[PDB]
Paper text:
The difficulties encountered in obtaining a sufficient quantity of pure protein in a reproducible manner for use in crystallization trials prompted us to redesign the tethered construct. The novelty of this construct lies in the presence of a thrombin cleavage site in the junction region between the PXRLBD and SRC-1 parts, where the –GGSGG– sequence has been replaced by –LVPRGS–. In order to assess the usefulness of the new construct and to verify that the new linker does not affect the process of crystallization, we determined the structure of the PXRLBD in complex with the reference ligand SR12813 with and without the SRC-1 peptide. The crystals of the SR12813–PXRLBD-Thb-SRC-1 complex, which have the symmetry of space group P212121 with two molecules per asymmetric unit, were grown at 4°C in MPD, whereas those of the SR12813–PXRLBD complex have the symmetry of space group P43212, with one molecule per asymmetric unit, and were obtained at room temperature in 2-propanol. Only the SRC-1 peptide region interacting with the PXRLBD is well defined. Similarly, the region preceding H2′ (more or less including residues 176–209), which is absent in all of the PXRLBD and PXRLBD-SRC-1 structures listed in Table 1, is no more clearly defined in the new model. A closer examination of the LBP revealed that the SR12813 ligand maintains its original orientation and specifically interacts with the protein.
The human pregnane X receptor (PXR, NR1I2) is a transcription factor belonging to the nuclear receptor (NR) family. PXR is traditionally regarded as a xenobiotic receptor, and as such it regulates the transcription of metabolizing enzymes and drug transporters, thereby facilitating the removal of xenobiotics from the body. To overcome this problem, we designed a new PXRLBD-Thb-SRC-1 fusion construct that combines the advantage of having good stability and solubility during purification with the possibility of crystallizing the PXRLBD with or without SRC-1 thanks to the introduction of a thrombin cleavage site between the PXRLBD and SRC-1 parts.
Numbering used by the authors: 141 to 176, 192 to 311, 315 to 432, 445 to 460
The structure:
Amino acid sequence: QGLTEEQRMMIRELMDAQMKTFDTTFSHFKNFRLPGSREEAAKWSQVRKDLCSLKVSLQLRGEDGSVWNYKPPADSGGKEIFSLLPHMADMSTYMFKGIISFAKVISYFRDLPIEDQISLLKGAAFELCQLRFNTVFNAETGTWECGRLSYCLEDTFQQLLLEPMLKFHYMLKKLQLHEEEYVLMQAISLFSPDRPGVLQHRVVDQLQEQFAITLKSYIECNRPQPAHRFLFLKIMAMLTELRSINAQHTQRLLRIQDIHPFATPLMQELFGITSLTERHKILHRLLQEG
Ligand SMILES: CCOP(=O)(OCC)C(=Cc1cc(C(C)(C)C)c(O)c(C(C)(C)C)c1)P(=O)(OCC)OCC
């Protein structure tokens, strides 16, 4: 090990939260939906760009051994480019509920004021959701293996690595991180002091730095040097790149939502779709429960 006692216990708590709130087999993801003027033309034309490189087919395995596969329609210029968004809204909403439950287990997060707990969740939800997706992603077949469900990227590796979120998943997977390293990335992402609407900048910054040092010292003392000499800094680089991709994808959601509303109420709150506690009643209730 080689970490202080505060540090070994800090990981213990994160790992615990991860264990209690991450459904790696997706056993409990049920009841989800499946497919069955000049100003506005530029809006639709930008949504096509927003959606075209994020297309997956869907595989769904049945208890009996049957397989249902779904290939999405090719872009014919109409509403058909939205066929998977209701299913994704349910998958992402299921994921965020787990992220919220993740944060509340953590003493340092729980000790923060409700309004700051909200702001931290609004800024980190996509990021922590995508870090969790990374651990079920298979880079050899381009597939997120989510228990009975599978999402495969449709062939069209050099054109894929153009979309920043897809390059991220490949780069991150290549690093071969430990469970403990993934969960530490989550904390560092969660306790970001310069999220919109955070009040206790000083406190959150102190907590983040405390988590980064634990990740830095975890790597020093659990990896053969100087092979992984810069793994910590690589991870920090990808956290920063992940903060940027979050913003881009949040703006994508809003453009799509503008012309084809589909976001769940929890998503509406998380991403600013229309008092910080009074404008986020679902989050507040989700945070005030046990
Ligand atoms: C705020 C961001 O929205 P969002 O959370 O939820 C939308 C319903 C988000 C969800 C998402 C993104 C990806 C990419 C980007 C890695 C391809 C996925 O592979 C997956 C699955 C479920 C297939 C694992 C889900 P979006 O980035 O990608 C849609 C595939 O949606 C933004 C428009």
